[PDB]
Amino acid sequence: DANDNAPIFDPKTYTALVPENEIGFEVQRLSVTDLDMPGTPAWQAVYKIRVNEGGFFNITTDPESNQGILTTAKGLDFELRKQYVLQITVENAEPFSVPLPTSTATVTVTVEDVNEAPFFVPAVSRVDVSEDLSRGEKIISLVAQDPDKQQIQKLSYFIGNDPARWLTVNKDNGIVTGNGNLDRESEYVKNNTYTVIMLVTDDGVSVGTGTGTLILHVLD
Ligand SMILES: *[C@@H]1O[C@H](CO)[C@@H](O)[C@H](O)[C@H]1NC(C)=O
Ligand SMILES: *[C@@H]1O[C@H](CO)[C@@H](O)[C@H](O)[C@H]1NC(C)=O
Ligand SMILES: *[C@@H]1O[C@H](CO)[C@@H](O)[C@H](O)[C@H]1NC(C)=O
Ligand SMILES: *[C@@H]1O[C@H](CO)[C@@H](O)[C@H](O)[C@H]1NC(C)=O
Ligand SMILES: *[C@@H]1O[C@H](CO)[C@@H](O)[C@H](O)[C@H]1NC(C)=O
Ligand SMILES: *[C@@H]1O[C@H](CO)[C@@H](O)[C@H](O)[C@H]1NC(C)=O
Ligand SMILES: *[C@@H]1O[C@H](CO)[C@@H](O)[C@H](O)[C@H]1NC(C)=O
Ligand SMILES: *[C@H]1O[C@H](CO)[C@@H](O)[C@H](O)[C@H]1NC(C)=O
Ligand SMILES: *[C@H]1O[C@H](CO)[C@@H](O)[C@H](O)[C@H]1NC(C)=O
Ligand SMILES: *[C@H]1O[C@H](CO)[C@@H](O)[C@H](O)[C@H]1NC(C)=O
Ligand SMILES: *[C@H]1O[C@H](CO)[C@@H](O)[C@H](O)[C@H]1NC(C)=O
Ligand SMILES: *[C@H]1O[C@H](CO)[C@@H](O)[C@H](O)[C@H]1NC(C)=O
Ligand SMILES: *[C@H]1O[C@H](CO)[C@@H](O)[C@H](O)[C@H]1NC(C)=O
Ligand SMILES: [Ca+2]
Ligand SMILES: [Ca+2]
Ligand SMILES: [Ca+2]
Ligand SMILES: [Ca+2]
Ligand SMILES: [Ca+2]
Ligand SMILES: [Ca+2]
Fold first, then answer.
1. Whose CA is nearest to atom 2 of ligand 8?
2. Is the CB of 125 under 6 A from ligand 13?
3. What is the secondary structure of 99-148 as a DSSP string?
């Protein structure tokens, strides 16, 4: 036998759908037909993409009908891109016994969306506030942000961490007011501090959590 033949794809252009993030996962498989002798290196396919955008793709070969098995190199992420036009050429392991036509496969990808958790913006060393505060007064009018611009999903603001009960939140407007009697003078307060953490949840359409710390400067 001789490497008289080159490999030929059975589709020339494919398509597949994909998800943003669990991932490193099988997108689509490809078909081809070289005509020289089967168990031979004049029959084993070798691939490669022409251009690897963020270099987030890997493709292996398989001794089945030595189909082209493409996958995800490093998860995706997005709301950044939906389209992927890339091309893969196929060779044999051993060079050709004649000039031949190299034949590519052109392929299109689409990224499905998964919706992620929201986040308070910072982790706040905010309110240098005094001990004389009136039980029920504006301390920190805060806000959190959520990724997915599909944004027709709101959330609810919940508090959480805790030495004892002073502060209070409007859950549908994230407003931290100050209820209670405080006293810079004494117990939990360690260095001039009082640190508290709170939460926020992604609803509207699925699930979410947001852990944000909050240090507030008490006064004398
Ligand atoms: C698109 O992708 C699907 C994946 O199931 C594939 O069957 C199809 O041949 C590809 N091409 C087009 C035009 O749909
Ligand atoms: C490989 O695919 C081409 C495209 O149809 C076809 O003509 C050829 O017969 C296939 N190879 C074999 C051994 O059938
Ligand atoms: C498929 O092709 C790639 C690209 O060269 C190669 O690295 C990989 O080893 C091949 N897979 C097999 C099983 O030969
Ligand atoms: C694949 O990318 C090409 C290049 O623009 C486009 O024509 C095609 O619609 C994309 N997806 C499918 C289903 O072929
Ligand atoms: C304040 O933050 C510190 C540092 O993590 C933590 O140990 C403490 O429990 C928080 N609350 C108070 C009242 O100090
Ligand atoms: C949000 O995260 C919290 C972490 O404190 C977790 O316990 C909770 O299950 C999450 N909520 C939802 C709705 O998934
Ligand atoms: C946020 O909530 C998650 C869910 O329990 C938790 O794992 C994480 O420690 C929390 N803290 C931050 C800063 O996200
Ligand atoms: C892609 O995944 C395969 C399977 O683990 C690995 O052997 C290979 O090094 C990775 N990268 C490339 C370019 O094939
Ligand atoms: C097409 O490119 C391949 C390498 O990817 C090369 O081996 C082949 O000879 C090229 N085609 C021609 C007609 O030279
Ligand atoms: C695959 O199809 C696309 C669109 O028709 C084209 O740009 C690309 O060059 C094709 N590859 C081959 C080998 O024809
Ligand atoms: C693969 O085929 C396409 C279209 O036929 C061609 O434009 C491209 O140059 C080829 N790629 C290689 C490496 O030969
Ligand atoms: C809360 O968020 C702050 C960021 O300001 C971080 O330093 C701290 O470790 C977090 N505490 C917890 C329990 O998540
Ligand atoms: C209070 O202030 C000092 C100086 O900024 C800081 O380094 C320290 O972490 C804070 N709390 C304690 C218990 O020292
Ligand atoms: Ca061949
Ligand atoms: Ca032959
Ligand atoms: Ca995303
Ligand atoms: Ca998303
Ligand atoms: Ca979300
Ligand atoms: Ca006091």
1. 58
2. no
3. ------EEEEEEEE------EESS-EE---B-TT--SSEEEEE--EE---
